[PDB]
Structure formats: C-alpha cells, structure tokens
Write a protein that binds this DNA or RNA. Structure first.
Length: 50
DNA sequence: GCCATTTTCGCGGCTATTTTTTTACTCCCAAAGTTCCGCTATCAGTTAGTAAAAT
C-alpha cells in the first residue's frame, strides 16, 4: 500500500531520493531515505536547565 | 555444655527539576512585674551672628 501510494504521487517506490551537498553541490554517492516525520518538542528545554 | 534454632540489627546507586499544612480547647480573682506615654533636664552638636584679621 505504501509503494502504491508513492507511485500515485509520482515518487520513487523505494522512498529514497538523490540528495546533493549544499556546501559543494556534489551528489551523495547513495540514495537517501527522505520523507516526513511527526516530531515533537518535549518539555526539556535548555533554558530551564542551564 | 555444646549444636541448633529463633530473634534482633542493619543494609539496600548518583546527579538534576517540579512543590508548605489541616482533630482534640473552663473560668475568675487577687497580686505582681512590666510597658508606654508624657515630662524633665543635661549635654553635645549645629547654626547664626559679630568682631578680628587680612587683603
């Protein structure tokens, strides 16, 4: 189902794209797993801990 | 009087960061020591005035 969803959106079925180094413009030698993750900001902030 | 069994005694990791708790209830009086306001009186400091000196 995930691969079918990727194919519908015109994206690689492996979920890996070709990325380039922004510092040099050179392509990384291998495809990189790029996607979207739900990330959280936990209540452990360096402001309250320093 | 030694061999085993029951009874105490003391122990169980280190750094951080958030936050109080809460039942239970005699009264009166006389005698004594202490405090709080007001006044006095003295001393020391401050300030105003005037003469002494210097420009």
């Amino acid at each position: 189902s995930i691969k079918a969803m990727l194919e519908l959106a015109d994206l690689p079925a492996s979920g890996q794209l070709t990325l380039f180094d922004g510092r040099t413009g050179d392509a990384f030698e291998r495809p990189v797993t790029v996607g979207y993750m739900y990330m959280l900001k936990l209540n452990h902030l360096v402001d309250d801990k320093m």
